[PDB]
Coordinates of C-alpha atoms and ligand atoms in Angstrom, one line a residue:
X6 CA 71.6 83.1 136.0
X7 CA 72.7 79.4 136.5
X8 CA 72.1 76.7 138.7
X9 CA 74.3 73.6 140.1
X10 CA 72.7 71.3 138.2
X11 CA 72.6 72.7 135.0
X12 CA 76.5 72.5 135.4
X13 CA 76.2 69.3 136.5
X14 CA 75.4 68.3 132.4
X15 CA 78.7 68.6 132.1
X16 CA 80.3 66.4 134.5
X17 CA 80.2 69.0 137.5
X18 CA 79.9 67.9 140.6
X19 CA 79.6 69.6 144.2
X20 CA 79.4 72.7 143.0
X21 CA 80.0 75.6 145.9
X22 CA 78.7 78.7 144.2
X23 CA 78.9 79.8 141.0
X24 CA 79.3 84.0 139.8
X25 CA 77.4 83.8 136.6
X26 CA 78.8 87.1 134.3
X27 CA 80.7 88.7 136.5
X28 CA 80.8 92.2 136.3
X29 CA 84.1 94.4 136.3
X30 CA 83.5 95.8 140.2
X31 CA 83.2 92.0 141.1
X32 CA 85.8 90.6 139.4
X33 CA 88.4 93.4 140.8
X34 CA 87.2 92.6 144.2
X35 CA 88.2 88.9 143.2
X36 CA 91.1 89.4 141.7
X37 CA 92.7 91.6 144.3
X38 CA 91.3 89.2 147.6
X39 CA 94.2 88.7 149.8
X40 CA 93.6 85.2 150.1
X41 CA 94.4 84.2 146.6
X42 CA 97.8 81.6 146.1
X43 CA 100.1 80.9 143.5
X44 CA 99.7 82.0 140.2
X45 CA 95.6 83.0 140.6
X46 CA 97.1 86.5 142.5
X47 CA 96.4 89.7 141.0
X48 CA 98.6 93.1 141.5
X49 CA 97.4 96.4 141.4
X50 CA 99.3 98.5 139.0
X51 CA 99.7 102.2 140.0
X52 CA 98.2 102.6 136.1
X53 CA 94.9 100.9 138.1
X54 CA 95.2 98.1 136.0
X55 CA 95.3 94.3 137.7
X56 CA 98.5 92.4 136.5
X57 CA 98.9 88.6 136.7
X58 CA 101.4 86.2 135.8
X59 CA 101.3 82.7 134.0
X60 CA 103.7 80.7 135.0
X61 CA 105.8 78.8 132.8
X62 CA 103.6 78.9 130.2
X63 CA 103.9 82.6 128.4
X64 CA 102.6 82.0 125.1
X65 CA 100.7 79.4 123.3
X66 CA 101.7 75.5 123.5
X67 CA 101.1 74.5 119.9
X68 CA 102.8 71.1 120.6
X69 CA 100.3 70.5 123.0
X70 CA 97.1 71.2 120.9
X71 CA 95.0 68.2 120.2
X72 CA 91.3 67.8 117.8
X73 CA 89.5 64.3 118.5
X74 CA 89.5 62.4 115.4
X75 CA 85.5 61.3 115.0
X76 CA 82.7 61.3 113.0
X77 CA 82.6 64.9 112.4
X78 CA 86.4 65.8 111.8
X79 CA 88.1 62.8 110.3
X80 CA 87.2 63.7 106.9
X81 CA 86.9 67.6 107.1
X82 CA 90.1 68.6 109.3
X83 CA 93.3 69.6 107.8
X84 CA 95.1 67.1 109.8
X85 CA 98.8 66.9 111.1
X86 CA 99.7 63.8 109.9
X87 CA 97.6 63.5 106.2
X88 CA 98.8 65.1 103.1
X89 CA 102.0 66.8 103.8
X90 CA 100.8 67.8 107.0
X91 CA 103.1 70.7 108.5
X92 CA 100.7 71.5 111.3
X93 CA 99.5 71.2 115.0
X94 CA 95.9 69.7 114.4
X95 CA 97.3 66.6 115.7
X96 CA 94.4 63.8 116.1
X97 CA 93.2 62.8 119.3
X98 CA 91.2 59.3 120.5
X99 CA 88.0 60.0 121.5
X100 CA 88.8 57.7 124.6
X101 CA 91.3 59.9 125.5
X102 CA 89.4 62.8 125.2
X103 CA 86.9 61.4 128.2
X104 CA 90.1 60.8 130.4
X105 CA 90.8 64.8 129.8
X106 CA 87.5 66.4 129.9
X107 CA 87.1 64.3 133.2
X108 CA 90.5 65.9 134.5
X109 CA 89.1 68.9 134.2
X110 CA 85.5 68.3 135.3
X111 CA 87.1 66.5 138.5
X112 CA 89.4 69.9 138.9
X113 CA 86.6 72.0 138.6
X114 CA 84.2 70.4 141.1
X115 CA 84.3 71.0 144.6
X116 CA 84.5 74.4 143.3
X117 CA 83.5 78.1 143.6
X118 CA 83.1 78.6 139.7
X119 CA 83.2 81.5 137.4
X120 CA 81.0 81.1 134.2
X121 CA 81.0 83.7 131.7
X122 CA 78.8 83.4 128.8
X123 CA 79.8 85.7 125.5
X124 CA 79.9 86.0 122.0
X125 CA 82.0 85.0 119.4
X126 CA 81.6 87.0 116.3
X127 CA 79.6 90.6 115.9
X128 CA 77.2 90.0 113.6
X129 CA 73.9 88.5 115.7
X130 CA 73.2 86.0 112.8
X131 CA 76.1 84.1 112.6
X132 CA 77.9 84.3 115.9
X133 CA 78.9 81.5 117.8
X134 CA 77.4 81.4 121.7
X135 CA 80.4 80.4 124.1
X136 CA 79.9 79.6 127.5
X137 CA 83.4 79.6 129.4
X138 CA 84.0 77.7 133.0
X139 CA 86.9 79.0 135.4
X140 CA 87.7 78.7 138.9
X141 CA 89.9 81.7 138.5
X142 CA 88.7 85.2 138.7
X143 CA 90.8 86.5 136.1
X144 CA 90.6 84.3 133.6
X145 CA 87.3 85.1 134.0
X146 CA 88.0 88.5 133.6
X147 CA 90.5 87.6 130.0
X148 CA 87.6 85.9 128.4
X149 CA 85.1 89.0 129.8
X150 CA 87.3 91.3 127.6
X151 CA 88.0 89.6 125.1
X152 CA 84.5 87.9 123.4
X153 CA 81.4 90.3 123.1
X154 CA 79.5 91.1 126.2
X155 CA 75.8 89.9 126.1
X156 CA 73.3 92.4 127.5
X157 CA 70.9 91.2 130.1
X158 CA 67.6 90.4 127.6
X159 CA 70.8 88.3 125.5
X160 CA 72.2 86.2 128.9
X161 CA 67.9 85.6 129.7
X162 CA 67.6 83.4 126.5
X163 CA 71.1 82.1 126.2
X164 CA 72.0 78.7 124.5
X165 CA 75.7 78.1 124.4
X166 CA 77.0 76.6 121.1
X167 CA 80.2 75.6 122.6
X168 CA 82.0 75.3 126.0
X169 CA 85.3 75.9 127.2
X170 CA 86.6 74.7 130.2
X171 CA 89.9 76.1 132.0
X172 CA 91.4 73.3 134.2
X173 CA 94.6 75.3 134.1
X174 CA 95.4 74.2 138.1
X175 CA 95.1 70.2 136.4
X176 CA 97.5 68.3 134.7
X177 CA 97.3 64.8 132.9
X178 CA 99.9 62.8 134.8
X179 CA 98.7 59.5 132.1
X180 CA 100.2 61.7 129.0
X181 CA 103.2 59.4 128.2
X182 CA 100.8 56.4 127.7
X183 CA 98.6 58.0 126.0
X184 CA 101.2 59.4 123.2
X185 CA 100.9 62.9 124.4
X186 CA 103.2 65.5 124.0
X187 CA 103.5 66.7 128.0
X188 CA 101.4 66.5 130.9
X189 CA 99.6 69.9 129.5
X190 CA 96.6 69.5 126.7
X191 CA 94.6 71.9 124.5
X192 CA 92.8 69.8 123.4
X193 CA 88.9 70.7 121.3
X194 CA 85.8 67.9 120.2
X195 CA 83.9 69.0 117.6
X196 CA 81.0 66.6 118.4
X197 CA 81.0 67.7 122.3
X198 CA 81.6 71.2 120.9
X199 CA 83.9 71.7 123.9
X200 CA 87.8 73.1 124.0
X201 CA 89.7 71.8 127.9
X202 CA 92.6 73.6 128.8
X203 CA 95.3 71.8 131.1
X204 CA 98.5 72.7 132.9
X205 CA 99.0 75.9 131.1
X206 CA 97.8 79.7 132.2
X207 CA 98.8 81.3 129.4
X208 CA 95.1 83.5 128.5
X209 CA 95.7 83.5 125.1
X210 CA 94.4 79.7 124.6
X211 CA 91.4 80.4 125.2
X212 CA 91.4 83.4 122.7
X213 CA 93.5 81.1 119.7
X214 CA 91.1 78.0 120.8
X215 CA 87.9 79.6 119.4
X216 CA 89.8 81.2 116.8
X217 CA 90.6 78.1 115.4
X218 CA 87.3 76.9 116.2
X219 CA 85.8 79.6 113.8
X220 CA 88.3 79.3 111.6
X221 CA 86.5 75.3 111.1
X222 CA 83.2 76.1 111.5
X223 CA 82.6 79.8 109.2
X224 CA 84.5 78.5 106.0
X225 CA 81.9 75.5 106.0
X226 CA 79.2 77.6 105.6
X227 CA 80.7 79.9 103.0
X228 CA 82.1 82.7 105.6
X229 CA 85.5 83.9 105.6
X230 CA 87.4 83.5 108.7
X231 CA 90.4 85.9 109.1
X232 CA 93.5 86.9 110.8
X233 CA 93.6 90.8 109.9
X234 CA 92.6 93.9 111.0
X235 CA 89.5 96.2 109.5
X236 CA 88.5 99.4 109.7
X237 CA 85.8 101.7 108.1
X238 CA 85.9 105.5 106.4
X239 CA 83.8 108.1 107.3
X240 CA 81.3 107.2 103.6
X241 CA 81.2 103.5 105.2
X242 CA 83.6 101.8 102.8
X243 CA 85.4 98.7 104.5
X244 CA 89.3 97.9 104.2
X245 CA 91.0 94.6 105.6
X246 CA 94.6 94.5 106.2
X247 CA 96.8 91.4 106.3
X248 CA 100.6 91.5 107.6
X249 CA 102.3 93.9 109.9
X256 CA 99.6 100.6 112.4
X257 CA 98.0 101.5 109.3
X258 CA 95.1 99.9 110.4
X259 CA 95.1 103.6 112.4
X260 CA 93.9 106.8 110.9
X261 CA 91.7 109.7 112.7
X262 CA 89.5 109.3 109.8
X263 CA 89.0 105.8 110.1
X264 CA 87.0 103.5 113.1
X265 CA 88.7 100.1 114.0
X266 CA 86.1 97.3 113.7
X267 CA 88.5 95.2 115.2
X268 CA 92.1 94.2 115.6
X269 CA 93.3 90.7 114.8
X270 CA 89.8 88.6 114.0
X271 CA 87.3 88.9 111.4
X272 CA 84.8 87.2 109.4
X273 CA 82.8 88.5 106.3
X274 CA 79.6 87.0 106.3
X275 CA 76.8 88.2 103.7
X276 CA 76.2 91.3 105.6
X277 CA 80.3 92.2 105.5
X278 CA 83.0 92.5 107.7
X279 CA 82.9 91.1 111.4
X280 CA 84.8 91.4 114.3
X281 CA 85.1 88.3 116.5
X282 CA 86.2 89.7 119.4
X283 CA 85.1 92.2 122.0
X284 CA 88.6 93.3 123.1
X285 CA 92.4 93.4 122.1
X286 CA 95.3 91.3 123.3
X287 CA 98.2 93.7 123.0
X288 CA 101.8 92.6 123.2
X289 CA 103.5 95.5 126.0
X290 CA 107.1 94.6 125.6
X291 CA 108.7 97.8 125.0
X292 CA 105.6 99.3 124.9
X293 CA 105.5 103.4 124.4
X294 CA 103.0 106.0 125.0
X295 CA 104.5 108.2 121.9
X296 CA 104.5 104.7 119.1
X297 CA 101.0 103.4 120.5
X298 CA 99.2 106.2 122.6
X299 CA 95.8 103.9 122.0
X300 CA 97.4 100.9 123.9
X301 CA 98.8 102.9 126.8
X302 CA 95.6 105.1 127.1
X303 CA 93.8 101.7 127.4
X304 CA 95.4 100.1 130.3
X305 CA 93.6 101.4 133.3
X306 CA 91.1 99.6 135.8
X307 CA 89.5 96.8 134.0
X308 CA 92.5 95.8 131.4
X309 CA 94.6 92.7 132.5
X310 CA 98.1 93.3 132.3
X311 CA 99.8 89.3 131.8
X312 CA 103.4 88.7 133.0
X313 CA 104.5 92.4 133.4
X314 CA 107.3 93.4 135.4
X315 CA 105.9 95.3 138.2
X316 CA 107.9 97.0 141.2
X317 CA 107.2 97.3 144.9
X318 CA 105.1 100.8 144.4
X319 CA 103.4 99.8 141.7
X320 CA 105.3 100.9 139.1
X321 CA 105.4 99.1 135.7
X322 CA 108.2 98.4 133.5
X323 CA 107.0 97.9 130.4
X324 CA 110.5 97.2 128.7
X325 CA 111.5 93.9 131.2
X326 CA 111.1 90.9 128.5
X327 CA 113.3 88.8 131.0
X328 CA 110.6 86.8 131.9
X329 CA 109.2 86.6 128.8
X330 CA 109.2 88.5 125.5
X331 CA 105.3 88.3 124.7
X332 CA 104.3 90.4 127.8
X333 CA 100.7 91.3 126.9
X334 CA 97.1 93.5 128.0
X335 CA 93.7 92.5 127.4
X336 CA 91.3 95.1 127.5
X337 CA 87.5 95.4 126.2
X338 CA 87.6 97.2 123.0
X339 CA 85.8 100.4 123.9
X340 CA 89.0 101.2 126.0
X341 CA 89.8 102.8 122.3
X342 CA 87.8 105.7 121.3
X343 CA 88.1 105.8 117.4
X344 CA 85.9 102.6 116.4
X345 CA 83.2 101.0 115.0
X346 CA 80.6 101.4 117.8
X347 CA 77.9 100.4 119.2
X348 CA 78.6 97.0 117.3
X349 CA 82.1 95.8 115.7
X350 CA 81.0 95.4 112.2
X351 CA 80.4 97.2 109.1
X352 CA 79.9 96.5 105.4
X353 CA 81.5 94.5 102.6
X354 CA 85.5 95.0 102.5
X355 CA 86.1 96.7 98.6
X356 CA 89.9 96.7 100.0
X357 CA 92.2 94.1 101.0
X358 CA 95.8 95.2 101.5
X359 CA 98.2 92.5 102.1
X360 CA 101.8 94.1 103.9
X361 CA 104.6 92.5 103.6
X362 CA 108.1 93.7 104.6
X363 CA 110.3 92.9 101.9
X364 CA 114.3 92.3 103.2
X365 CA 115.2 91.1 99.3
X366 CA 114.4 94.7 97.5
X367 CA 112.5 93.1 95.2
X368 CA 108.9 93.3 95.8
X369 CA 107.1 96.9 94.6
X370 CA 106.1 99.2 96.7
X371 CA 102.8 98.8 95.3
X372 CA 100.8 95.7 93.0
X373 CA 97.4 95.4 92.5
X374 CA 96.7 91.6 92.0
X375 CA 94.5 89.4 90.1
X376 CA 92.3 87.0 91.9
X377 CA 94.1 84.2 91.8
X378 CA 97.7 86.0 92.8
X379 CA 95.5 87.1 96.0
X380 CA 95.1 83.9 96.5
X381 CA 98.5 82.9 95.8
X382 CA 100.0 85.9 98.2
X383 CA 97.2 84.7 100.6
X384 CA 98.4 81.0 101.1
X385 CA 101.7 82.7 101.3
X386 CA 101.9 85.3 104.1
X387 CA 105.8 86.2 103.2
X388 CA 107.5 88.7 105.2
X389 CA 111.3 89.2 106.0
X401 CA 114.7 90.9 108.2
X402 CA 114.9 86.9 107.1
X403 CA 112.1 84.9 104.9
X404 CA 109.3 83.8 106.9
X405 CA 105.8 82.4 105.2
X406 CA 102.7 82.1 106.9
X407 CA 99.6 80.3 105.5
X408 CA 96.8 82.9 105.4
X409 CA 98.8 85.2 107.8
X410 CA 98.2 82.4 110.2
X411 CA 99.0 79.3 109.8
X412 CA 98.5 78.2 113.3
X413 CA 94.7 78.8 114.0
X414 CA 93.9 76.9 110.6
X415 CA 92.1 74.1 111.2
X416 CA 91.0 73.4 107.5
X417 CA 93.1 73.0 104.3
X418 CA 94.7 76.9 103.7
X419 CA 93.0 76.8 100.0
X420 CA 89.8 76.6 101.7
X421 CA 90.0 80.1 103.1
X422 CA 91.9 81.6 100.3
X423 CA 89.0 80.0 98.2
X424 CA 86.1 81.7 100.6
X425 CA 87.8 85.2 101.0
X426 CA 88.4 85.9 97.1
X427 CA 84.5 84.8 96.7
X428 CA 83.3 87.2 99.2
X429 CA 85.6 89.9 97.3
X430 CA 84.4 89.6 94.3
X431 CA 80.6 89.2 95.8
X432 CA 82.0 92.9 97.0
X433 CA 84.0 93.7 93.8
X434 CA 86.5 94.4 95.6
X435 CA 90.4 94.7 95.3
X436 CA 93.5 93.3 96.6
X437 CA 96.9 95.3 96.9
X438 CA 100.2 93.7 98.2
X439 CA 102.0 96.3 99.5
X440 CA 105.8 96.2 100.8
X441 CA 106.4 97.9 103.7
X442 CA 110.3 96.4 104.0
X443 CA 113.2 97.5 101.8
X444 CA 114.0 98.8 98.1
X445 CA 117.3 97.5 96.3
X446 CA 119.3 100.0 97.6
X447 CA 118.9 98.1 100.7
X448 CA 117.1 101.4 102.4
X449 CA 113.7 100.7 104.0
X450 CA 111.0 102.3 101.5
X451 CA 109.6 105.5 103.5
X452 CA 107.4 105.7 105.8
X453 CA 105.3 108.7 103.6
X454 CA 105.5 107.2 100.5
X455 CA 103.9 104.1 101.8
X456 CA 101.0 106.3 103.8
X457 CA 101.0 107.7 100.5
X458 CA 100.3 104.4 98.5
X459 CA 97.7 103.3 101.1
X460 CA 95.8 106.9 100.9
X461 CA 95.6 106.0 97.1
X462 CA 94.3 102.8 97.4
X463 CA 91.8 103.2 99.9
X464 CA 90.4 106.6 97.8
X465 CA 89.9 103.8 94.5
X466 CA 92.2 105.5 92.9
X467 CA 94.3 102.6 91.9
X468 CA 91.5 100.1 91.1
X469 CA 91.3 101.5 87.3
X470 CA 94.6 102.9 87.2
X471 CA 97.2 102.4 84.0
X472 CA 99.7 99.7 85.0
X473 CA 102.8 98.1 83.9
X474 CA 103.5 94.4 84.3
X475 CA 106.7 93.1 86.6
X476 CA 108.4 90.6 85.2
X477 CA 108.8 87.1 86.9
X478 CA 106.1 87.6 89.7
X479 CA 103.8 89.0 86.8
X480 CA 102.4 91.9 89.2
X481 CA 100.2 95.2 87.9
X482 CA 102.4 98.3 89.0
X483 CA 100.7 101.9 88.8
X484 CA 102.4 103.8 86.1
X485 CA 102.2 107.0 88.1
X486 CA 100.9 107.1 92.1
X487 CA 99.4 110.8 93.2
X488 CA 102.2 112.3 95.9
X489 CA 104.8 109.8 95.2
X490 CA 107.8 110.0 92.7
X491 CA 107.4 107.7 89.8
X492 CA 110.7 106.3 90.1
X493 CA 109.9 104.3 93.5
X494 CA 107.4 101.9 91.8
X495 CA 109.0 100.0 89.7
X496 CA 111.1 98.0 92.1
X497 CA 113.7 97.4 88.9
X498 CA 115.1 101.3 89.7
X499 CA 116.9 101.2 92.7
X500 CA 119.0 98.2 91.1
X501 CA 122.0 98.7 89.0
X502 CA 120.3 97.1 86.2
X503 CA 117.0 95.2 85.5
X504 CA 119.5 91.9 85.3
X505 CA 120.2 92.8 88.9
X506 CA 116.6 92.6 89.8
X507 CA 116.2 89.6 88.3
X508 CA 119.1 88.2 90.0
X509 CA 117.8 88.8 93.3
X510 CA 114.2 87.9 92.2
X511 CA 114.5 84.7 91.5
X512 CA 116.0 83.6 94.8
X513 CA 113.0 84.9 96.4
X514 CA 110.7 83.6 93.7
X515 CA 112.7 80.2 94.6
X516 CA 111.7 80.7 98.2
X517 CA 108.2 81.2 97.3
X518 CA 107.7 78.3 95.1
X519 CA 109.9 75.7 97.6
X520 CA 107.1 77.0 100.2
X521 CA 104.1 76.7 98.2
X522 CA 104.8 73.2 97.4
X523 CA 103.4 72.2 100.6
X524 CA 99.9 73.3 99.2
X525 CA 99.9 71.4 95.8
X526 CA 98.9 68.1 96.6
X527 CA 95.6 69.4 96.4
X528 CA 93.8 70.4 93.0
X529 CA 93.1 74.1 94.4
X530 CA 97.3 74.6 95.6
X531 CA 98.4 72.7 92.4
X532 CA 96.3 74.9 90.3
X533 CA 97.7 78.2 92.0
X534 CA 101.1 77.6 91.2
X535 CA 100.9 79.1 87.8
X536 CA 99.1 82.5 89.8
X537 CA 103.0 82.2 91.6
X538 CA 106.1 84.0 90.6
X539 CA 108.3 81.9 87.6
X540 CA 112.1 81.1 88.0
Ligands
CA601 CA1 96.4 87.3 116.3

């Protein structure tokens, strides 16, 4: 347990009582106590699930996210406003900082206090202790589902590695002054090893806060940090999945959904939960989700009626409705911890709108790299570094760098796989790419005869087991290769007008020959 004064390190002060890991019966009493106000109030769904709502805020505040500039960041950081930038890890004074940790040391004293201590990352050896402070029940209960749950002989000699502190009920009234964006602040200190949250309810922060956090500390000590889904076959062999579903098969466990690292033992999962988007959501398209949202999920900014009833389709609040849950609220995975071996497959989807890309590439190291720092999908181009550009807190190269290192520690192989459209302007079906992934993930391709695209330069199977021939080369559904080409090249354009951004370093400017050629 934990004592007044031991908060009191922190800049705590008058501390009423403090519920030290809450369990799931506690913090559905809490959540559901009558006497709650504003936006802390919890409803009972007639699913059994508590639903809350987050005020304005109903999805992340990028412009508000701030990383003290000190000792221990200025020259490691991939900073907003060095090199070309393009990001949110906008510097922050360290004087500054004091003024917003004390906001939200001031809010939280005088308080009853929720403190939930967890893990981030699976694998014992390299995951990061987080000890998280609330004065509301259920964001007590988000950060309870989402990191790892320490067991009782785990909590007895606990030593937190970081701290986050929710001061969502404060706000920073001095912001203008201080060159802020708002009156709301993310804001993290790598030498205080603490992330503050102000003005804004929205639970994902706290989930995207340590995710960036990882995503600074893991790559520094030669561990991939990743925004991808993994999952295991039944003889143990690992496959992560980048893009976009197909991270679901019977005959495969989920390790985890969204967050992973791959450490020298192999593939982690950060988390201890899932953070489902609900809008629209269906029992028939994602029976796992539904199934999961019962007592001890959180629905967030749901539409629910008088009786209870939810209606999962209202986005006129917002459109990122979302459910936390713990991640044994799915059957099929990894279990009893979310990690397996080395990844020998890494599939990155991409939905092509252009018609150009094959259905299926096997690529060299240095194009996974290149398709990595990318993150194209489209039905309209977008590109995201490393399939997440916002949670990067160091260069992009510096992950693409790690994860093709623990690859080919693994020997393992990348696929980029297009889920979109073919150039009759027809999405590519639905069997022939469960098809393509069934071949991958059974080796199949790894040694398989190839042929050579122009203008990207990508390895195509020359035949693909329970697909017809013709779909692979991405040349035949085009009146002519010319036609191909035609359409190619404005997307190769688009690829190398976004890559630019990444050349002013030796690792991006040496990739660009790995890139597609006008
Ligand atoms: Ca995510």
């Amino acid at each position: 347990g934990l004592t007044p004064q031991e908060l009191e390190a922190y800049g705590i002060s008058d501390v009423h009582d403090i519920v030290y890991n809450p369990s799931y019966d506690l913090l559905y009493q809490e959540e559901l106590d009558p006497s709650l106000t504003g936006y802390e109030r919890g409803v009972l769904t007639n699913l059994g699930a508590v639903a809350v709502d987050t005020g304005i805020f109903t999805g992340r505040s990028p412009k508000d996210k701030y990383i003290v500039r000190d000792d221990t960041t200025r020259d490691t950081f991939w900073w907003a406003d060095k090199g070309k930038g393009k990001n949110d890890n906008k510097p922050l004074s360290p004087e500054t900082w004091q003024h917003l940790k004390g906001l939200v040391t001031r809010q939280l004293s005088g308080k009853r206090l929720f403190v939930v201590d967890a893990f981030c990352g699976a694998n014992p050896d390299t995951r990061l202790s987080v000890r998280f402070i609330t004065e509301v029940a259920w964001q007590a209960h988000f950060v309870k589902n989402m990191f790892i749950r320490p067991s009782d002989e785990e909590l007895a000699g606990f030593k937190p590695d970081f701290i986050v502190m929710n001061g969502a009920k404060c706000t920073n009234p001095q912001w203008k002054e201080q060159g802020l964006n708002s009156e709301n602040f993310v804001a993290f200190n790598l030498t205080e090893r603490m992330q503050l949250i102000g003005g804004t309810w929205y639970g994902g922060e706290m989930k995207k806060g340590m995710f960036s956090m990882m995503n600074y500390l893991l790559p520094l000590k030669g561990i991939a940090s990743m925004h991808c889904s993994a999952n295991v076959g039944e003889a143990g062999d690992v496959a992560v999945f980048f893009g976009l579903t197909l991270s679901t098969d019977p005959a495969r466990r989920l390790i985890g959904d969204d967050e992973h690292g791959w450490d020298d033992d192999g593939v982690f999962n950060f988390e201890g939960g899932s953070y489902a988007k609900t809008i629209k959501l269906s029992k028939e398209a994602e029976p796992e989700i539904y199934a999961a949202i019962r007592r001890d999920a959180l629905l967030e900014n749901v539409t629910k009626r008088e009786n209870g009833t939810i209606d999962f389709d209202d986005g006129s609040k917002t459109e990122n409705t979302r459910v936390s849950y713990p991640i044994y609220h799915i059957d099929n995975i990894v279990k009893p911890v979310s990690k397996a071996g080395h990844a020998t497959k890494v599939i990155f989807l991409t939905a092509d709108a252009f018609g150009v890309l094959p259905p299926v590439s096997r690529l060299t190291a240095d194009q996974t790299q290149y398709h990595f720092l990318s993150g194209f999908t489209a039905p309209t181009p977008t590109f995201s570094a490393c399939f997440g550009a916002a949670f990067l807190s160091l260069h992009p190269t510096q992950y693409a760098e790690v994860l093709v290192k623990r690859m080919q520690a693994a020997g393992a192989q990348a696929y980029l796989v297009n889920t979109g459209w073919n150039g009759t302007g027809k999405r590519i079906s639905i069997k022939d790419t469960r098809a393509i992934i069934d071949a991958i993930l059974n080796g199949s391709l790894d040694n398989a005869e190839t042929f050579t695209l122009p203008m990207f330069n990508l390895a195509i199977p020359t035949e693909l087991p329970g697909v017809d021939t013709g779909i692979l080369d991405p040349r035949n559904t085009y009146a002519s290769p010319e036609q191909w080409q035609e359409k190619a090249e404005t997307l190769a354009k688009l690829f190398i007008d976004n890559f630019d951004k990444y050349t002013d370093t030796p690792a991006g400017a040496a990739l660009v020959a790995a890139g597609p050629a006008l």
